[PDB]
A paper describes a structure:
MpPA14 ([name] [name] domain) lectin is a domain of a 1.5-MDa adhesin responsible for a symbiotic bacterium-diatom interaction in Antarctica. Bioinformatic analyses indicated the presence of an ∼20-kDa domain near the C terminus of MpIBP that is a member of the [name] family, which is a carbohydrate-binding lectin module widely distributed across several kingdoms of life. [name] domains share a β-sandwich fold and the presence of two consecutive aspartate residues in a cis peptide linkage (DcisD). The DcisD motif coordinates a Ca2+ ion that is directly involved in binding polar vicinal hydroxyl groups of various carbohydrates.
Galactose has its C-4 hydroxyl in the axial position instead of being equatorial as in glucose. Having just shown the 3,4-diol of galactopyranose cannot complex MpPA14, binding of GalNAc is completely abolished because its 1,2-diol is unavailable due to the C-2 hydroxyl being substituted with an acetyl group. Similarly, since the MpPA14 binds galactose via the 1,2-diol (β-anomer), the lectin cannot interact with galactans, as they are polymers of β-1,4-d-galactose.
Numbering used by the authors: 7 to 190
Write the structure that this text describes.
């Protein structure tokens, strides 16, 4: 547009809290669409939690975000339910990949507009090995994530494999870009 966006080795993060129930992806997306973010942050190391007693309460969000919490724009007030919306880019070579995500509650990850990892409901801590997807051309791929907590425990760690599920890595500053330019 007319405003420069910060270039960092991470995704652009937004946190939203609510006192309504989050049951599914559409509920969290409606929350995101309903207001300005309760806080913004840089999501440079996307391995959050685990903790207890509601992500949206007290300092639980800070604890959940860990290393990334130092970039919070503000300390949100309490809510019962809450979640994050992350957007930016991830450097991937052409090839085949799959996510394996540990989470409480649900989430959705999309790459180049296509969902590649989805849990459309609340759940206690579970790890799902998602189906494989292909990247046609090497470079920075567009990626967005949503995750939420309806209450209770909370964790979010979406790991990626490039080698058919033999090894997995966290998405972090090695490969993330907020704008699709290279972070130095
Ligand atoms: O489905 C029930 C589960 O819901 C999760 O949101 C919560 O973190 C768990 O502790 C358990 O209550
Ligand atoms: Ca801009
Ligand atoms: Ca919004
Ligand atoms: Ca707080
Ligand atoms: Ca941590
Ligand atoms: Ca930090
Ligand atoms: Ca709730
Ligand atoms: Ca929960």
């Amino acid at each position: 547009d007319s405003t420069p966006d910060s270039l960092f080795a991470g995704l652009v993060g937004e946190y939203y809290g609510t006192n309504s129930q989050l049951n599914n992806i559409s509920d969290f997306r409606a929350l995101v669409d309903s207001k300005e973010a309760d806080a913004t942050f840089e999501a440079a190391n996307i391995s959050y939690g685990r903790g207890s007693s509601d992500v949206a309460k007290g300092t639980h969000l800070q604890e959940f975000l860990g290393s990334d919490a130092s970039t919070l724009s503000t300390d949100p007030g309490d809510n019962t339910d809450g979640g994050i919306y992350l957007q930016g880019y991830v450097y991937l070579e052409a090839g085949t990949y799959n996510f394996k995500v540990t989470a409480d509650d649900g989430y959705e990850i999309t790459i180049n507009g296509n969902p590649v990892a989805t849990v459309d409901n609340n759940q206690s801590v579970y790890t799902v090995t998602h189906a494989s997807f292909t990247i046609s051309e090497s470079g920075y791929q567009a990626i967005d994530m949503i995750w939420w907590d309806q209450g209770g425990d909370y964790v979010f760690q979406p790991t990626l494999s490039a080698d058919g599920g033999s090894t997995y890595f966290v998405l972090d500053s090695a490969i993330l870009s907020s704008t699709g330019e290279t972070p130095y």
